[PDB]
Amino acid sequence: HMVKKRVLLWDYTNTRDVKWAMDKINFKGPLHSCSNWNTWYPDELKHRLPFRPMIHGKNNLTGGEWQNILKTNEEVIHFFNEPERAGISPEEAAKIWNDQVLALRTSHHKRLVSPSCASDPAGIAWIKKWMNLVAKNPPDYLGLHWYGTKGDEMIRYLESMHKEHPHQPIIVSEWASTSRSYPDVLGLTVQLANWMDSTPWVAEYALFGCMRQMADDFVSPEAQLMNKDGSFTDLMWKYMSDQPMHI
Ligand SMILES: OC[C@H]1O[C@@H](O[C@@H]2[C@@H](O)[C@H](O[C@@H]3[C@@H](O)[C@H](O)O[C@H](CO)[C@H]3O)O[C@H](CO)[C@H]2O)[C@H](O)[C@@H](O)[C@@H]1O
Numbered sequence: 001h002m003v004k005k006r007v008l009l010w011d012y013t014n015t016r017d018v019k020w021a022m023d024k025i026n027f028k029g030p031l032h033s034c035s036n037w038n039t040w041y042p043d044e045l046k047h048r049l050p051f052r053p054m055i056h057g058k059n060n061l062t063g064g065e066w067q068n069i070l071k072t073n074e075e076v077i078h079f080f081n082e083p084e085r086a087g088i089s090p091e092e093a094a095k096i097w098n099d100q101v102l103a104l105r106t107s108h109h110k111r112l113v114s115p116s117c118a119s120d121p122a123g124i125a126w127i128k129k130w131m132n133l134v135a136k137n138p139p140d141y142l143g144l145h146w147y148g149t150k151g152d153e154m155i156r157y158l159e160s161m162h163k164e165h166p167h168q169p170i171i172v173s174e175w176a177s178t179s180r181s182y183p184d185v186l187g188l189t190v191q192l193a194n195w196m197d198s199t200p201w202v203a204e205y206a207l208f209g210c211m212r213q214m215a216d217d218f219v220s221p222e223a224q225l226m227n228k229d230g231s232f233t234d235l236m237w238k239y240m241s242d243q244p245m246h247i
């Protein structure tokens with residue numbers, strides 16, 4: 001049976017500039033859901049996959065941003081994106097969770113993803129502290145990011161975080177190879193897709209790079225899932241079409 005755990009990360013620049021690109025997505029392959037780092041829904045999706053709204057940061061707790069979260073028909077909602085790098089302490093995020101976000105479960109019966117921190121000591125320590133602070137009202141999923149060049153190290157990290165936090169499944173809300181060598185990008189992507197596909201405690205995983213411009217200097221141009229014209233790279237085709245993935 002077709003294993004369907006792959007998330008379509010749909011950056012708002014796609015919605016802003018190249019809506020039409022969504023209609024070129026393959027929906028008959030292992031794509032299973034969609035997120036866009038925002039509270040609001042990408043209309044061009046036309047409900048062809050479940051959407052996970054995100055409470056990205058403190059700017060998304062009030063006004064029309066919070067109204068989008070309160071009114072959504074979608075089942076799963078992400079909390080803060082890399083809060084350890086936006087000056088949000090574990091204690092401050094635990095308070096906002098109890099006072100405001102938890103109601104989305106107790107009252108609106110949504111499932112909640114923990115904040116997704118970076119795979120560095122600062123991030124590992126942040127999520128360790130926050131999960132302890134809200135242990136009496138834990139999240140439904142543990143949200144993880146991972147960027148690097150060695151697939152064996154991402155596997156060891158997921159296995160490591162699953163042992164440290166064994167009470168819920170893991171969502172990899174962002175991951176990618178940062179290698180500038182395309183064979184090493186393709187090799188890691190294929191390895192981790194197939195490994196996570198056959199690992200029950202990984203609910204879903206979200207490959208980064210489906211946008212026209214480079215996000216920053218950190219991510220690899222060889223790992224891009226969209227060309228500058230808005231067409232899809234061969235890596236994107238394989239991601240959304242092939243199960244198992246192959247090089
Ligand atoms: O700051 C730029 C960029 O950083 C991203 O986080 C990275 C981590 O992905 C990276 O992870 C390392 C792995 O690549 C490596 O294989 O293993 C080590 C541990 O042995 C990991 O730490 O670590 C660096 C810190 O040196 C982080 O910068 C963020 O997710 C991203 O948002 C940001 O753009």
Ligand SMILES: OC[C@H]1O[C@@H](O[C@@H]2[C@@H](O)[C@H](O)O[C@H](CO)[C@H]2O)[C@H](O)[C@@H](O)[C@@H]1O
Nearest residue numbers: 149150151152183184185187188191247
């Ligand atoms: O096989 C998993 C690992 O793949 C590595 O890339 C390989 C390259 O080093 C080599 O040159 O080519 C093969 C395919 O011909 C690649 O698979 C990645 O660099 C690793 O991160 C990954 O774990």
